[PDB]
Design a protein around this nucleic acid. Structure first.
Lengths: 306, 335
RNA sequence: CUAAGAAAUUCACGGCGGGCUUGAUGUCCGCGUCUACCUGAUUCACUGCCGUAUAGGCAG
C-alpha cells in the first residue's frame, strides 16, 4: 500500500518448530499471515521506539523440513506428534494433531519513517535483530546462531540510491545475499485467468476447481503431463467474514474485552515459489495486510509484483 | 468480585532447542567443533513372544504354533562409532524475560492483580530458588535421560553468549551433582544469578549447553523417539523411529524442557521419586499417576486462584511451584 | 500482537538354512584441425662490514 524508503534484510533465521498446518486444506510452509503478523509485532515492540514503520515482508525459505513420515503401503503422509502430559486421573489425553516443521528464512522488511535519518542504519538493523531474536515466527522459537563459524549480520539498505547503477548493484548484491532460497509471491491474477480459461473449457466451474487444477499433477492422453509455469502452491489468502462484527464485550471467552470480535473462515488463494533473481525489485516481494473491515475480506497479499 | 479470566495463557519461558547428538573421543572434548554427527541407521530384529498371555493362549500347542511364526521388526538404531567412546550433546537455551506476564488474558483487573502478585513474589525473594533449580538441572545431565544412566564420566560445559562470543563459560561434573538434591555452589550460584537476571529482564539471555558423556566405545545412544500413530493400516510398519534434524540424531526440544522443569520437590506425596516436572495437576508420564490432585488444595489452578483472588498466599514452596508453572506456560481459563 | 498461547513415545528382541547361470559370435569402411603471439612487470629485499645489540648505521 506504500513504497518503503529502505529494505531491512533480517538474516538467516533458524525457526525450530513452525506450524506446518497452514490452512484447513493445505499443509507445509506456514501461512504468509504468520510472517506479516510477526513483522507487525516487531513494529509494535521495537518499531515504535525507533520512530520507524515495519510493513512488508519478503519470504525466501532457505531451508525447509517438516516433521512428517510416510507409512508403509500408503502414498500419503502423516504428522509426527508430541506426547502431551497426562490428565489429572493418570490417563492419556485425547491427541490433537498438529504439524511442526523446521525453517530457515531471511526476511526483507519494508522500512519508512523519520528514524532512518534519526538513527544509523546499522544501529536500527541491529536492534531489530536482537528484538526478533527473542520472538516466534510461526509458533516456533528462533535459533540465534551461537558459536558457529560466523553469524550473518543484519543489513539495512536505503532504496534511494545515489544513482540508478548504484541502486541496481545494491539490489543485485542483496539478492546474492539471500541466494539459496525461493521468494514466495501471490498469484491471484493468474488464478482468475486460469479460472476464466477453465470456464471457457467447461461452464459452472468455481475458483476452487481452478486452484486444485493449478496444483495437481495432470496427465493427458496422447501420456504427457500438463506443464506448470512455476511451483504454484495453494496458500491461504486471508480471512472472510462469517458473522456480524460484535462489540468488544459481546463475545464470551474472547482474547480481550477491548477489541471487536468477528467470526471468520479461511480464504484460499494461489501462490508461487520463485528464485529472487526473477524479480525487478526486491520490494515487490513484500507482503502487506489488506483488511477492509466493512465487507470482511481480512486479507494478506503481495501487491505490485507484476 | 475479581472473577477469574475466561481465557488465560502464558508464553513458554526458558525454551531450549533440539539437542544435537555427535560423537568423538574423550580428552579431545575441546576440539569437538568438527566431531562427526551420530546417524540414525536401520537394522532388522527377530524376537519371540514374551508378553503376558490372556489364559486362552496358554495352551502349549497354540504357544508353540505362535512361536513357530517368526516375529520380525525393523527398528531405528543410533550407535557411537566403533572408535569413539564419547557422546556430545549440544543445544541452545533462551531464558526469556517478562516471566510473570500472561500472553493472553481477558479481565484487566485480573491483569493488575496477577501482575501485583508476581511483583510481590519477585521483590520478596525473586527467582533465586527457581533459577537455582534450573541451573542445577542444566549442570547435571538430566537432559540426556537414558544417555546419563551408564556413562563413566559426564561433563557439562555451559557458555553465555552475549553478542557472538562467550561472555562467561561454565564447566561442571554432572555425575558429582545429584539428580535429586539442590545444594549450593559458587559457579552454580553464578549460573542461577544469570538465569534469574534473564527471567527478570526485558530481553533474553542465551546459553549453549554442551554435555560430553563417556558412554563406551561404539555403544548405543538414545535419541528421542518419534510419536507416529499407526492408524490401523494393514501394512506392518517400523516399530521404532528415532528423531533426527539433518542426518544427525537429536532429542526433542520439549524433552529437554521436561528435563529442565524437573524441579518440583514440593508435591504432597513423598519425595521417593525426587523432583518432578512442573506441570498442572502434577502429572508424571513415567509413573502414570498425577500428584497434586485437585481434591487436595495443592494443584496449580486452586493455588493460583487462592493466591490472586482471595489473597490466600500459599507456602513459599507452593509460591515457587506456581511461579514455575508460570515459567512453563500453558493454556488456562474456564468457559 | 504470528490457526495466537501449552506438551517425555517407550520398554524388550537370533532372520538363516541350501544352491553350476551357462552355449555361440568379424565392428567397419573414409578423413588437411588450422592461423597469429615480448612472460615480466624495479619479481634476486641480495653479499659483506661498524656495533654486545633483534637498537641503529655503513660498503658495491
Amino acid at each position: 500500500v506504500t513504497d518503503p524508503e529502505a529494505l531491512l534484510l533480517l538474516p538467516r533465521l533458524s525457526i525450530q518448530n513452525a506450524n506446518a498446518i497452514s490452512s484447513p486444506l493445505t499443509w507445509g510452509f506456514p501461512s504468509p499471515g504468520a510472517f506479516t503478523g510477526f513483522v507487525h509485532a516487531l513494529q509494535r515492540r521495537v518499531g515504535i521506539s525507533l520512530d520507524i514503520e515495519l510493513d512488508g515482508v519478503g519470504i525466501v525459505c532457505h531451508r525447509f523440513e517438516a516433521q512428517i513420515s510416510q507409512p508403509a503401503g500408503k502414498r500419503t503422509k502423516v504428522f509426527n506428534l508430541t506426547r502431551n502430559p497426562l490428565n489429572r486421573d493418570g490417563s492419556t489425553a485425547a491427541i490433537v494433531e498438529e504439524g511442526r516443521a523446521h525453517l530457515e528464512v531471511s526476511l526483507l522488511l519494508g522500512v519508512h519513517g523519520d528514524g532512518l535519518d534519526d538513527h544509523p542504519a546499522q544501529e536500527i538493523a541491529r536492534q531489530v535483530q536482537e528484538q526478533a531474536g527473542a520472538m516466534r515466527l510461526a509458533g516456533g522459537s528462533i535459533l540465534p546462531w551461537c558459536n558457529e563459524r560466523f553469524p550473518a549480520p543484519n543489513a539495512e539498505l536505503l532504496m534511494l540510491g545515489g544513482s540508478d547503477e548504484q541502486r541496481r548493484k545494491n539490489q543485485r548484491r542483496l539478492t546474492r545475499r539471500l541466494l539459496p532460497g525461493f521468494a514466495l509471491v501471490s498469484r491471484e491474477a493468474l488464478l482468475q485467468q486460469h479460472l476464466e480459461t477453465l470456464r471457457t473449457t467447461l461452464p459452472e466451474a468455481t475458483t476452487l476447481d481452478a486452484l486444485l487444477d493449478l496444483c495437481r499433477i495432470n496427465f493427458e492422453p496422447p501420456w504427457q503431463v500438463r506443464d506448470k509455469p512455476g511451483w504454484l502452491v495453494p496458500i491461504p489468502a486471508g480471512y472472510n467474514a462469517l458473522s456480524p462484527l460484535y462489540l468488544p464485550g459481546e463475545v464470551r471467552n474472547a482474547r480481550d474485552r477491548e477489541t471487536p470480535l468477528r467470526f471468520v473462515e479461511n480464504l484460499f488463494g494461489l501462490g508461487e515459489w520463485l528464485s529472487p533473481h526473477r524479480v525487478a525489485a526486491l520490494s515487490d516481494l513484500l507482503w502487506y495486510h489488506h483488511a477492509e473491515p466493512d465487507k470482511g475480506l481480512y486479507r494478506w497479499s503481495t501487491p505490485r509484483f507484476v | 468480585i475479581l472473577s477469574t479470566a475466561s481465557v488465560l495463557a502464558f508464553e513458554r519461558k526458558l525454551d531450549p532447542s533440539d539437542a544435537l547428538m555427535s560423537a568423538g573421543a574423550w580428552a579431545q572434548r575441546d576440539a569437538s567443533q568438527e566431531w562427526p554427527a551420530v546417524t540414525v541407521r536401520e537394522k532388522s530384529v527377530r524376537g519371540t513372544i514374551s508378553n503376558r498371555l490372556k489364559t486362552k493362549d496358554r495352551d502349549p500347542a497354540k504357544l508353540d504354533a505362535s512361536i513357530q511364526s517368526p516375529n520380525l521388526q525393523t527398528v531405528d538404531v543410533a550407535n557411537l562409532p566403533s572408535d569413539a567412546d564419547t557422546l556430545k550433546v549440544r543445544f541452545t537455551l533462551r531464558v526469556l524475560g517478562g516471566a510473570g506476564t500472561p500472553s493472553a488474558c481477558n479481565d484487566a483487573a485480573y491483569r493488575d492483580k496477577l501482575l501485583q502478585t508476581v511483583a510481590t513474589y519477585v521483590n520478596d525473594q525473586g527467582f533465586a530458588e527457581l533459577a537455582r533449580r534450573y541451573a542445577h538441572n542444566l549442570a547435571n545431565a538430566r537432559f540426556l535421560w537414558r544417555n546419563r544412566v551408564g556413562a563413566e564420566a559426564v561433563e557439562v560445559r555451559i557458555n553465555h553468549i552475549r553478542q557472538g562470543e562467550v561472555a562467561r563459560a561454565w564447566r561442571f561434573d554432572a555425575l558429582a551433582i545429584g539428580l535429586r538434591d539442590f545444594k549450593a555452589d559458587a559457579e552454580l550460584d553464578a549460573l542461577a544469578e544469570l538465569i534469574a537476571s534473564g527471567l527478570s529482564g526485558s530481553g533474553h539471555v542465551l546459553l549453549e549447553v554442551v554435555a560430553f558423556a563417556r558412554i563406551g566405545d561404539g555403544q548405543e545412544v538414545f535419541p528421542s523417539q518419534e510419536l507416529i500413530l499407526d492408524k490401523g493400516d494393514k501394512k506392518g510398519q517400523k516399530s521404532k523411529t528415532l528423531y533426527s534434524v539433518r542426518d544427525a540424531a537429536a532429542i526433542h526440544s520439549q524433552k529437554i524442557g521436561n528435563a529442565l522443569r524437573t524441579i518440583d520437590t514440593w508435591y504432597p506425596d513423598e519425595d521417593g521419586l525426587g523432583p518432578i516436572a512442573v506441570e498442572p495437576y502434577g502429572s508424571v508420564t513415567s509413573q502414570g499417576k498425577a500428584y497434586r490432585q485437585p481434591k487436595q488444595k495443592l494443584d496449580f489452578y486452586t493455588l493460583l486462584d487462592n493466591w490472586v483472588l482471595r489473597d490466600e498466599a500459599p507456602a513459599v514452596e507452593q509460591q515457587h511451584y506456581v511461579i514455575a508453572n508460570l515459567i512453563r506456560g500453558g493454556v488456562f481459563g474456564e468457559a
